[PDB]
């Protein structure tokens, strides 16, 4: 018939690192639907299909995932009704037919399950983000509480600094306007503060749009944070979430954390004595991706103080999940589209994680695009929970003005924040 | 009737700064149509209405310019024709009644103007580059060669090199697709190079995505873009285009360059010297805002082989290029639409540079957003020539991203690059 599926076609774009990735425009009679996917240049994930042609980007070429867009999936697509998310995504992955998406690609898989959710919404007369909380049966909306990338550290800067990422967060805001003025206010207050502490070379922005002063001590980021918060004006109104991607540092050959050379139970210490000094509220990756032992002791240990994220330990994998479920090695999953594949079983992984009491939160990848699918995302999903990094960066603040624009549109009593943070 | 503007709305986002800039949304019967305004930091320009409340975005507020949208500009607005772009430009214009668009603010008036353009073009039945284009007069389109952001100086880095801006443009390139290609693999050589020759934590970039290495040196930057070219593997096909921000070392008061100090004619020897050696193929505002003589004698000298652009000397200003015309003071035209105010004024000054023997080189600003309108204007205009910074951050990849997509609708006959300097 009529409102149906007319064309599917994908191409190569470029994400905010100059790197290559897919992109697909699902068009129907309502118009041109397009989504990109993420890229965390970076083995639980859905496979990334890479052209591996060092005559172009340096083999980092999306073509052969677009190509299986534009040949396999998408004129399979043609005729079908997008209103049937979970139908199509099935279609998909029973299209590539592999575990991991290796044969056709969760790079293209990914842009056709986006796009037919866009064009699905289009088609029912609704925004995305109410089109996808229907399709999880959320009953509440809400805003989210941005935790933003402010300070780098280990294999992300030159630094003396071990730990990855090192974020702040205006928990007690009342509103996501509020809490993304607060949240550049201070990270202007933070520019100044490091400026000062390290030179004017020193302010230049990551990936994430943070910064990577070349902090030579360890006990130094976290006060750097307080101040700065202090200084804009919001002094207690924030709290921080920690990464620290435990993993880049961990050698089982010696079980070994080299900071230098330091320990698990002798790491949950200084994580417990951060957390008791300083209002950390979350910690991501604390150990490493099998440590589950050590995983499961430190979710406990900070339980109702600070959340435990799970990253390269659930690396948004079902199996994974499960595994941490049972054995409560965390209590928050860090929810990456890219890294699972599909909406459906993107929005199936959050379901069962807060059915089990966990919470979610909603992140980008150190490669996104102008893209803001998970704006609408993690409004949908009510977690109140989403890491698109500092309010600085066209790929990152791209989200933060598409939540600007659902909470406008969804009114005053509009819900924001995390409960268990404000 | 029926096709006709039906709301206009605007309201404050950030840019890629963390800074509030404004973002206007014309609704009709074929849709919401929003746009977003650019904003450089930092007398001749449209003026730009800032809150000035210390209180809020440490007086970097937009609610002043939103405010002007909501209340004066769009119940103006509502019920007219959108296809009629110059009369409500002009609309505008009388409804501010200044000639700076002091009253109204040109980041008021601007998203209007654009906003407007894309609702007309839609009613019209084909995309924004065609529109403007047949609003331009344009003969031909064409995908505009990008010059790439790579290397900072002056009051852009915390630097011993004091010029601004150092590009590398893909002028041999056959297609935007290569263009944007190359231009990539070269910045990743660089960011080995720079690496290399200055360390890990010299690799993080500005706000124009480039780099800013610790150039304690003034003969480095240009030998550095060539080995990267050399390296990338693209030797020979690459120029370069430099932006000098001049004004930034001279003061009158001595009438000097302080690069240590230097003058004038003893500074169009430095030019000479690199427009000799090196495929520097465009230099920006060699001189002081006001040094017209030593402008037009810079430009005179290097024609042909060099094209003089002004930016702090015809700050896309009326009065300012005509004067500029007259005196042959540069023979390139920097276009900065929120530096003009709307549509019309911007496109009108585009040809009379045009028509005078002049290049138009369009340009984002340092604060940015995801908008992508400059895409379709640079290609409506047919100039071959724009600046979106280097293929890194969204607010930069969204517009290259978006030429892709023109290209792509064009078809494999369209037009790529700058004539003078295929
Ligand atoms: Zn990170
Ligand atoms: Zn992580
Ligand atoms: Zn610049
Ligand atoms: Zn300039």
Known sequence: ?????????????????????????VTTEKGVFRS???????????????????????????????????EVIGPALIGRDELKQEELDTLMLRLDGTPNKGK????????????????????????????????????????????????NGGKHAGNALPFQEFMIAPVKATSFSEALRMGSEVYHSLKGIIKKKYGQDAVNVGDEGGFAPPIK???????????????????????????????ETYDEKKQQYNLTWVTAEQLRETYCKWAHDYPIVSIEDPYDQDDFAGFAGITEALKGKTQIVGDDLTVTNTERIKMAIEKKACNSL???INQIGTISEAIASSKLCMENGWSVMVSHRSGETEDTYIADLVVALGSGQIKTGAPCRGERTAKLNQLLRIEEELGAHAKFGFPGWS
Do not use: W
């Not at 018939?1 to 990735?21: A, C, F, W, Y």
């Not at 037919?116 to 509480?145: C, N």
């Not at 360890?218 to 993993?247: Q, T, V, W, Y």
């Open 1 to 25: 018939s009529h409102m149906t599926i007319q064309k599917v076609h994908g191409r190569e774009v470029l994400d905010s690192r100059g790197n290559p990735t897919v992109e697909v425009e």
């Open 36 to 70: 990109a996917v993420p890229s965390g240049a970076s083995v639980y994930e859905a496979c990334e299909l890479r052209d591996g042609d060092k005559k172009r980007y340096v083999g980092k070429g999306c073509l052969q995932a677009v190509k299986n867009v534009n």
């Open 104 to 151: 056709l690609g969760a790079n293209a898989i990914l842009g056709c399950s986006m796009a037919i959710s866009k064009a699905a919404a289009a088609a029912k007369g609704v925004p995305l983000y109410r089109y996808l909380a229907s399709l999880a049966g959320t009953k509440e909306l809400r805003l989210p509480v941005p935790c933003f990338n402010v300070i």
């Open 217 to 247: 001590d360890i006990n130094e980021p976290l006060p750097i944070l307080m101040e700065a918060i202090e200084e804009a004006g919001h002094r207690g109104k924030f709290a921080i979430c920690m990464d620290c991607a435990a993993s």
């Open 334 to 336: 860090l929810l990456k």
